[PDB]
Enzyme design. Sequence first.
Site, PDB file in Angstrom:
ATOM      1  N   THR B  12      52.246  67.523  60.165  1.00  0.00           N
ATOM      2  CA  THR B  12      52.264  68.807  61.274  1.00  0.00           C
ATOM      3  C   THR B  12      51.137  68.517  61.914  1.00  0.00           C
ATOM      4  O   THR B  12      49.933  68.448  61.275  1.00  0.00           O
ATOM      5  CB  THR B  12      52.654  69.740  60.596  1.00  0.00           C
ATOM      6  OG1 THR B  12      51.578  70.477  59.737  1.00  0.00           O
ATOM      7  CG2 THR B  12      53.936  70.037  59.995  1.00  0.00           C
ATOM      8  N   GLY B  13      51.193  68.723  63.402  1.00  0.00           N
ATOM      9  CA  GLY B  13      50.262  68.782  64.285  1.00  0.00           C
ATOM     10  C   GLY B  13      49.496  67.322  64.283  1.00  0.00           C
ATOM     11  O   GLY B  13      48.401  66.988  64.218  1.00  0.00           O
ATOM     12  N   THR B  15      49.782  64.685  67.087  1.00  0.00           N
ATOM     13  CA  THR B  15      49.798  64.190  68.330  1.00  0.00           C
ATOM     14  C   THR B  15      48.306  63.812  68.758  1.00  0.00           C
ATOM     15  O   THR B  15      48.207  63.079  69.855  1.00  0.00           O
ATOM     16  CB  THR B  15      50.463  64.974  69.405  1.00  0.00           C
ATOM     17  OG1 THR B  15      49.993  66.162  69.655  1.00  0.00           O
ATOM     18  CG2 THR B  15      51.996  65.163  68.699  1.00  0.00           C
ATOM     19  N   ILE B  18      42.578  64.334  64.265  1.00  0.00           N
ATOM     20  CA  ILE B  18      42.579  64.180  62.988  1.00  0.00           C
ATOM     21  C   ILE B  18      44.168  63.719  62.645  1.00  0.00           C
ATOM     22  O   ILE B  18      44.067  62.790  62.011  1.00  0.00           O
ATOM     23  CB  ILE B  18      41.820  65.188  62.254  1.00  0.00           C
ATOM     24  CG1 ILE B  18      40.301  65.162  62.505  1.00  0.00           C
ATOM     25  CG2 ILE B  18      42.391  65.024  60.591  1.00  0.00           C
ATOM     26  CD1 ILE B  18      40.048  66.554  61.888  1.00  0.00           C
ATOM     27  N   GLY B  19      45.075  64.544  62.916  1.00  0.00           N
ATOM     28  CA  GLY B  19      46.307  64.516  62.702  1.00  0.00           C
ATOM     29  C   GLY B  19      46.923  63.117  63.134  1.00  0.00           C
ATOM     30  O   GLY B  19      47.422  62.353  62.240  1.00  0.00           O
ATOM     31  N   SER B 137      38.212  74.031  57.214  1.00  0.00           N
ATOM     32  CA  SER B 137      37.112  73.881  57.999  1.00  0.00           C
ATOM     33  C   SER B 137      35.703  74.383  57.252  1.00  0.00           C
ATOM     34  O   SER B 137      35.996  75.272  56.451  1.00  0.00           O
ATOM     35  CB  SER B 137      37.250  74.761  59.415  1.00  0.00           C
ATOM     36  OG  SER B 137      36.086  74.610  60.085  1.00  0.00           O
ATOM     37  N   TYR B 150      38.433  82.947  63.466  1.00  0.00           N
ATOM     38  CA  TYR B 150      38.881  81.606  63.043  1.00  0.00           C
ATOM     39  C   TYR B 150      38.409  81.347  61.584  1.00  0.00           C
ATOM     40  O   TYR B 150      38.939  80.519  60.939  1.00  0.00           O
ATOM     41  CB  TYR B 150      38.267  80.613  64.061  1.00  0.00           C
ATOM     42  CG  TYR B 150      38.446  79.249  63.601  1.00  0.00           C
ATOM     43  CD1 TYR B 150      39.563  78.397  63.652  1.00  0.00           C
ATOM     44  CD2 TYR B 150      37.579  78.282  62.765  1.00  0.00           C
ATOM     45  CE1 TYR B 150      39.888  76.975  63.742  1.00  0.00           C
ATOM     46  CE2 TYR B 150      37.700  77.040  62.739  1.00  0.00           C
ATOM     47  CZ  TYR B 150      38.702  76.367  62.809  1.00  0.00           C
ATOM     48  OH  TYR B 150      39.159  74.893  62.629  1.00  0.00           O
TER      49      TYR B 150
END
Lengths: 234, 228, 240, 234
Positions: B12-13, B15, B18-19, B137, B150
Site C-alpha cells: 500500500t502506498g 506510487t 520507499i513504496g 519512523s 506525526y
Amino acid sequence: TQRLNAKIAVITGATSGIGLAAAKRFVAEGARVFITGRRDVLDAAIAEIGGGAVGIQADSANLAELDRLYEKVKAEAGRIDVLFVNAGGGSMLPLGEVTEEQYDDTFDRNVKGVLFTVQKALPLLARGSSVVLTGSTAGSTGTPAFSVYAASKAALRSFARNWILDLKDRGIRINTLSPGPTETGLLNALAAQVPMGRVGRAEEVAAAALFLASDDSSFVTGAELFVDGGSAQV
Amino acid sequence: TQRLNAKIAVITGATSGIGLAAAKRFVAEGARVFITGRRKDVLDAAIAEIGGGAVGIQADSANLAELDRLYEKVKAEAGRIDVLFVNAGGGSMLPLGEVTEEQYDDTFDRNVKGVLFTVQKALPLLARGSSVVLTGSTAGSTGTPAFSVYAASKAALRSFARNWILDLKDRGIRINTLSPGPTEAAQVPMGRVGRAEEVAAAALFLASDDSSFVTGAELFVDGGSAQV
Amino acid sequence: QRLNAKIAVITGATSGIGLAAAKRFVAEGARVFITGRRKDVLDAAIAEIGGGAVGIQADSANLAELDRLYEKVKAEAGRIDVLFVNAGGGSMLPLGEVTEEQYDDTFDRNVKGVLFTVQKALPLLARGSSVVLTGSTAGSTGTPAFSVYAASKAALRSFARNWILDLKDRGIRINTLSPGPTETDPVQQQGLLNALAAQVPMGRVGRAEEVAAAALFLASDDSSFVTGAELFVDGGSAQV
Amino acid sequence: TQRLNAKIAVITGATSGIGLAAAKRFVAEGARVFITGRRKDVLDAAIAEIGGGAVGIQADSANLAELDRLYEKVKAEAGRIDVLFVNAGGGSMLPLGEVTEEQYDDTFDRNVKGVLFTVQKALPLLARGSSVVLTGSTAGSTGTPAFSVYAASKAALRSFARNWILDLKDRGIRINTLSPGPTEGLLNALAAQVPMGRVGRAEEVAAAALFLASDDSSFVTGAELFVDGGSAQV
C-alpha cells in the site's frame, strides 16, 4: 545467490553454533572466509565449511594473538570487508553467589576481548565494511542468575552506538545482532516465552548476520537487530 | 537473486518513494505484486515503471470500504497474501499551541487507523509463513520540534507489531516495523540521508525467509540517527 | 507540604490512581481541581478528597468541555502549577475483531483528548510547572487483545519527548508516568489479579497510593531536572 | 519533613559532586549516613561539610577487601542498611583506535565489577523494604565520541537493575538505576544539547536519588530514572 561475492570475511568464534552457521552461509554466498577458534576442532570446522575457508587459531580475548591473526589476514587477503565477532563467555550464578572468576571470565571474553578484536581490525577494515557484534536478548531483559552475562551483553550493544561516532567518515558500519535462545526440558520452557512458540535456529541467526554483513543493510548502523521470535519485543 | 519466488506481495502506498522502490525490488526478487495509490495518473506511471506484471488498484488505504475492494481483487486474482507492506505515511509540522484537530485527525486516520484496518482486512488472506511490514519512523522514538502529532502516530504504529503477534499466535504471520530515518544530514552518523532502495532492501529482508525468526521488531534504517 | 500553594488540575480523578493522586496532592498542600464525567461520582470523589478540592464536570473527548474547564480554573485560581492528565481508559479486542468505535473512542480520550488537554492548558501553565501524563506498561510491551489501548499509550509517551522541544524556554516540564498492574465477575477479577501478580518481579500488583506517590515526585520540585522522561511504577514488570 | 527518618544509608563515592549532595540531602531527611571515599583528607573534609552525625569510611571499590572492611564497620555500628546509593565510579575519554587496556580495566573495575561486589557484599545487611540506587548515565543508552568504554560500563550498570531484582525475589529489596545527564566552555556546549537549556545541579540529582531511596518509590524497581533535563529523551 552470491550476496557476499568478492568480500573478505573474518568470523571469531566460528567453530560451533551461530559462528559456524554464519561461516557456512558466508561461504555459500561467495565470501572468502577466515575463522578463529581456540582449539583441532577448528580443523574439523574448516573441513565442514569448505569452499576455501581458512582457520586461524587465536584466543580472541588474548591481545598478542590478535596481532598474529590480523598479520595473517593482511598477508593473505589484504583487507577485511566483514567482521563478525562472536564471543563465548557465560554461566549462571545468582547475586550472592557471583565469583570474581565468573565476572572476569565473562567480561574478558564478551566485552574486553571484543573491543580489542575490533580495535586491532581497524587498519584492515575497508570502505563499505560491516562489523557485526553478537549480542543477546539477555542484554535488555531480566533473567534469574544471569546478571554477569546480561551486563556483558548490554555493554556489547553499547559499543555499536559509540564506535560509529569514533569512525566518522571511514565507511565502517557497526551493528549488534541479538539472538534469543537457540537449539544450540529447558528448551520447552524457553519456547513457551517466545511469541513464535519455539526457540531459534543457529541458521536463522546466521541469515540475519548475512543481512548486516551484506550491502543490503547499507543504511543500517549503530543498530540492534533482534532475532528472538518476538521474545524481547513483548 | 529470487528471494520472493512464488510469493504474493501487496504494497500500500507504492506510487513514489520507499513504496515504489520496494515494489521494484520485490518484482526483481520474483514476487507477484499488487500496489495501491490514491491518484490514477501517478499509479499508471508507477505500474509502467515497476513492470514485471505488477497490478495497480486505485484505493485510499485509510478508507475502509476501498480496502474491501482491494482485498476482493487480491482474493480473486491471487487467492492469498505472502507479503504485506503497509507504507502509509505523511504528516505535517505544527508546534504544541498551534496543533489543529485537522492535523491530528488527518495524521492519525492515515498513519494509525488506516494501518490497523489495512492489516485487519488482510488477515483472511495472510498465509502461513507470511510477513507484514509496517512503515514506522525514527520520529516514533525521538523528539523533534513541531512534529508531535506525526511522532506520536509513528510510536502508535510501532506498538502494533509488539501486540498483533500475540493476537495471531500460531497463525505463522510475522509482523515487523521498518523505521527509516531521513531519506532522499549533519545529525546522521553516516553523514548523509538514506536512499529509497536502501529502505527497500531492508523491507526485503523482513519480507523474506531470511528474517524467519524476526517478529515484533523495529528495524531502523537511519544511518545511526536514532541509535546515538 | 511538598505542593504548598500549588494549583493542581487532575483529569479523571474520581476513582483509582487519579483519586489517590488528588488525595495525596491535597495532603501535600495543593489546591486541587479534579474532573470526571459523572456528576454523582464526581461529587462523591470530592467528598472523599476534602481539603477544599473542587470538581468540574468534563470529558476530554470533548474540546468544548475542556474550554469550560480552563475558563473555570482561570477564574478561580488564575494559573496551573501541576497538570496531571490521567483521564483515559480502554478495552480488549484482538486483531480481527477491532471496531472503528474501539479505535476512535480509545484514541479520542487517550491521545487526542490528552493533546488538547495540554494545549488548552498552556496559557495557564506557570514557569516551573509540571505536566504528568498517565501512560502504561502496555505502551512498550505486548499484551493479547490490547493493541488499540497499547498503541494509544505508546502515542501518549511520545508526546513527552516532543512537547519539551515545542516548549523550549517556557519552564514547563512534561513527563510520562507509566503504571503496571494496579488494584483499581468478582471471582474472575481475583483470578486475573493473581495471574498479573505472578508476572511482577515484586510478586504483587501496585496500590493506587504508590502510583500517586510517583506522580507527586514528578509534580514536585524534587524532579526539577526530570523532563521528557517515562517513569515506570510497575514493580519491575516492564523492566525484565 | 523527614523522609528517611531512622534509615541507615550507605553512599559510596560521596566526597564531591552528586554523592556529596546526596549525603547532605539524606542527612537533612533524617538518615544516619555512612559515606565512602578514596582519599582520607578529602573524606574527612566531606564529613565535616555534611554534619548531622555522618560517618566516613575510607574505601576503594576496585578493592574487594576494602568493601569487606566497609561492611564490617556498618554492621558493627548500625547493624543494617536501608538505603544503598552506589555512586562511586568514573571514566575518561579515548576513541576506538586509541583505547588502552588500562582505560578499559580501570573503568570496568570501578563502574561494573566494583558495583557488583559493593551490592553483593551488602546483601546480608540489606533490610526488608530497602532500596539500592545505582548511578548510571545517559551515556549508557546514547552515542558519544571517544566515550565507548565509559558508555559500555554504564550500559552494563543499568542491566544489573533488571536482573538482580529477579535474583532477590521475596527479599524486599528494590534496585533502580539513577541516570544523570550533564551536571555542573565545555559546559555551554553540553547545555545547548539539553532541552531544558542548562546543565543539572548536583542537588537536583540528589533529589531524584532521594525519591528512589524513599518509600514514595515503593512500587518502582528494575527501572532507570533519567535526570537529564531531557538530554537522552529526545
